[PDB]
Design a protein around this ligand. Structure first.
Ligand SMILES: *[C@@H]1C=CN([C@@H]2O[C@H](COP(=O)(O)OP(=O)(O)OC[C@H]3O[C@@H](n4cnc5c(N)ncnc54)[C@H](OP(=O)(O)O)[C@@H]3O)[C@@H](O)[C@H]2O)C=C1C(N)=O
Ligand SMILES: *[C@@H]1C=CN([C@@H]2O[C@H](COP(=O)(O)OP(=O)(O)OC[C@H]3O[C@@H](n4cnc5c(N)ncnc54)[C@H](OP(=O)(O)O)[C@@H]3O)[C@@H](O)[C@H]2O)C=C1C(N)=O
Lengths: 452, 452
């Protein structure tokens, strides 16, 4: 557990992991806090949540600097992330009570309804790629619902993890309602197996999700998994090509490519493929790579040496198999974990890369001849998180919406998360939904009540 | 896999388990069937579901005889079970389309909404205690939603399992949309690990649920677990005592005691405990034990020799520890797996039985002094399925509703399932909800759509 600046490779600060006894003490405190917190009014929870939003809104640049220092996303995009974190806090402050109101169903009972009550301690395991937003995405509805939470954040963002707890303390949430656990992956099993822990949510890779979900399953505890994707970005002949190129470039390269809903596989109708690809090539080549603290920077370093090694290998093996590099395709010879925007074409059938997530600014490009071929190729992956399709033909739009095997389909725009709309995967991308109504309904006891 | 009549102990018919190759073939057919079935209209699904209801409504006595023969519940209660099976078919026929309609949310999109689409093949693992109802509980919404299903039923109800498939075939559901798998517990892992199987649901005991959920978690597949309970039946001084005794007797002894939402622990306020307990004793004492095919029978045999052995041991060990037998407490000296209505009192603190499910007509009785003590004792179990409380004081009613740790709280009535209201557990009783809106929302892709 350490801050290692990916721009310089320098070790900035190390942290001692909690011991099992310390983890136990935190869970005992969470349980005690829950017994009181479940009795708080929505007005109190709303006040504290809105206070947290105001803290995020005031000190956006400072929080952004922590994110950038630890994991290398641009400071400007980290500012946006802090702003979006405030937004989801406000969303559940504004809607959470209504979303949890009794729902009455007419029967022969004098009263029959479902009410919604918190479960207790929720474990959250989170990744470094959106180190504030993913935490607030689960924490805002958890806290509004009256759950308490323990967070196991990624081992390379301890300062972000501590900052989130500090924000919630300063906002006024009682001690034990939210606790950051500075612990490694091997220490999570103790938490899942603790009788006081009632549920678990993980955003991350498949092996992490499989580990957490298998353990939780053994303990009869509900889970939600938000895993990776290889989202298609489909461009058809009636599309606004210049908009599609611009937006596609952002979709692939934002967050230095490290997003679950990045545009990863560009699927181009043959009628427009040559024009699109040339423009894509030019746009990618103009991106500014460098110090993520500089406001002009488009592409900072990848977050870790491991990610750099992995993408470098994935690309090298694809090229060895016969894939062509249109742009990029090799790590930069400079300090920090830098990998350039890359475009791969003519990838051989059966190449392993076709089935993998490229968690870096590396676009795979394909050409197709018709709608059926586009949909088949789009779905020919183990994942099913998001999908974007570009067309102004209403019949095509409807087929894309209906037939793309994903948790989200965006027509003529890049996939984005928005607190107003539920968000989650299908297939190997996970199950369950965050945000919207779903986010606050996942980890509550929907209690049926019948009164004679 | 066999029909063994629990009234006589006679082995009536044996069945060959499917081989792994045969299971694979059924999954291949389910996948092909799903590809077409997902394209059917709600009108077709509704027709087939309503046809299934009409079949159940016409031949209720015949289906009931199969249930009674295989697992020993009274023929009269099996008729009611067939009727309730028809009811949940009609519920989803009548509401399913509306329940799955697009839900629009205003954004800057021209259109933004959530739509609901089937996942694919759902595995269901079901128990012998309600061999028709629990199947239709999951199958009706699955089929209305456009999923297909494979059923692994309990090994002692193969004729029930085959009958459910035959009903659905006769109703018009296309081949492969629903398939009964005559397979043992060891064969379920293959099904969960098959890439075509997208989700799994289990109703049963904790070890079964832990096995299925841990395996599904490893495969990144969503689950729903409906497990056992030790539901409290709390009786306070303002209760209608005679009604509470009558209803409590039904709640403990229906289905020969073998219900997840049986009243298992009677928690009596000291002011009324003597009167209530005497009346409960009297009611249990005069229940008619005998051939479950006879309409006058209240109590048939327990379903299996294993259940009989288990309850006999649980009671014996409790008594050896110091518990008192007010009534019953030993197997009957006759053919078939008969165990009599039993009441245990004065159970020593720390006796293991206090924490166990009594899946037989055996009531544990406790006395308490006030509301706080009643709630504490009611919740002092690993389970949390249902809870019933009897009082006509509004303040007490509200505290019971709010503070009983269960998925369902019934005031002045016994806990029952009803298609109109969601149903499920908390704590070690499971997670997820069947019935109501919840039942048809569990295993669908909630797909967010955003159209510029
Ligand atoms: C949208 C945004 C992101 N994602 C998807 O997440 C992954 C990110 O990849 P990576 O950072 O490499 O994930 P990871 O799984 O290694 O780590 C994530 C967290 O899980 C912990 N962890 C790893 N392994 C385990 C085990 N076995 N048990 C418990 N916890 C584990 C990690 O801990 P450390 O190793 O850092 O200590 C970390 O906390 C991409 O696939 C991305 O697409 C999902 C999104 C969405 N759907 O919302
Ligand atoms: C309302 C009604 C019932 N219940 C709860 O269910 C159990 C019933 O007890 P029992 O019949 O003894 O359950 P079981 O778990 O042994 O068997 C149930 C099904 O699961 C299969 N099975 C057992 N073990 C496994 C494993 N390891 N893997 C997969 N499948 C398994 C059984 O198969 P067979 O052994 O018969 O072949 C069977 O299909 C009580 O606790 C009751 O309260 C839940 C209800 C509710 N919440 O809705």
């Amino acid at each position: 557990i350490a801050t290692i600046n990916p721009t310089t490779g320098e070790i900035c600060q190390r942290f001692k992991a909690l011991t099992p006894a310390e983890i136990d003490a935190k869970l005992a405190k969470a349980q005690e806090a829950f017994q009181a917190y479940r009795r708080t009014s929505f007005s109190q929870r709303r006040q504290w949540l809105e206070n947290a939003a105001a803290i995020l809104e005031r000190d956006t640049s400072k929080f952004a600097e922590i994110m950038t220092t630890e994991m290398g996303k641009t400071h400007q995009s980290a500012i946006a992330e802090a702003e979006k974190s405030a937004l989801v806090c406000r969303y559940y402050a504004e809607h959470g009570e209504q979303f949890l109101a009794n729902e009455y169903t007419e029967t022969q009972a004098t009263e029959s309804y479902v009410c919604y009550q918190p479960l207790g301690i929720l474990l959250a395991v989170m990744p470094w790629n959106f180190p504030f937003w993913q935490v607030f995405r689960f924490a805002a509805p958890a806290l509004m619902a009256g759950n308490v939470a323990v967070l196991k954040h990624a081992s390379n963002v301890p300062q972000c993890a501590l900052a989130v707890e500090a924000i919630l303390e300063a906002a006024g949430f009682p001690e034990g309602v939210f606790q950051t656990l500075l612990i490694g992956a091997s220490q999570v099993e103790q938490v899942i197996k603790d009788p006081r822990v009632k549920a678990a949510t993980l955003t991350g890779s498949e092996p992490a999700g499989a580990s957490l979900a298998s353990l939780a399953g053994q303990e009869i505890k509900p889970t939600l998994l938000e895993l990776g994707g290889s989202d298609p970005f489909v461009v058809f002949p009636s599309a606004d090509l210049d908009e599609a190129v611009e937006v596609g470039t952002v979709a692939r390269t934002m967050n230095n490519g490290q997003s679950c809903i990045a545009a990863k596989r560009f699927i181009l109708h043959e009628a427009i493929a040559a024009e699109f690809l040339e423009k894509l090539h030019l746009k990618f080549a103009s991106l500014k790579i460098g110090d993520p603290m500089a406001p002009e920077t488009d592409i900072g370093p990848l977050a870790t040496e491991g990610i750099l090694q992995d993408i470098s290998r994935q690309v090298d093996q694809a090229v060895a198999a016969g894939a062509k590099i249109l742009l990029g395709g090799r790590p930069l010879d400079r300090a920090g974990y830098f990998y350039p925007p890359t475009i791969l074409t003519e990838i051989p059938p059966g190449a392993k890369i076709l089935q993998e997530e490229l968690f870096a600014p590396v676009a795979m490009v394909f050409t197709v001849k018709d709608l059926d071929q586009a949909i088949a190729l789009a779905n020919d992956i183990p994942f099913g998180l998001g999908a974007s399709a570009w067309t102004n033909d209403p019949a095509e739009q409807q087929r894309f919406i209906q037939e793309l095997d994903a948790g989200a389909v965006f027509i003529n725009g890049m996939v984005k998360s928005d607190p107003r709309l539920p968000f989650g995967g299908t297939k190997r991308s996970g199950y369950g939904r965050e945000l919207g109504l779903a986010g606050i309904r996942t980890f509550v006891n929907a209690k049926t009540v019948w009164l004679k």
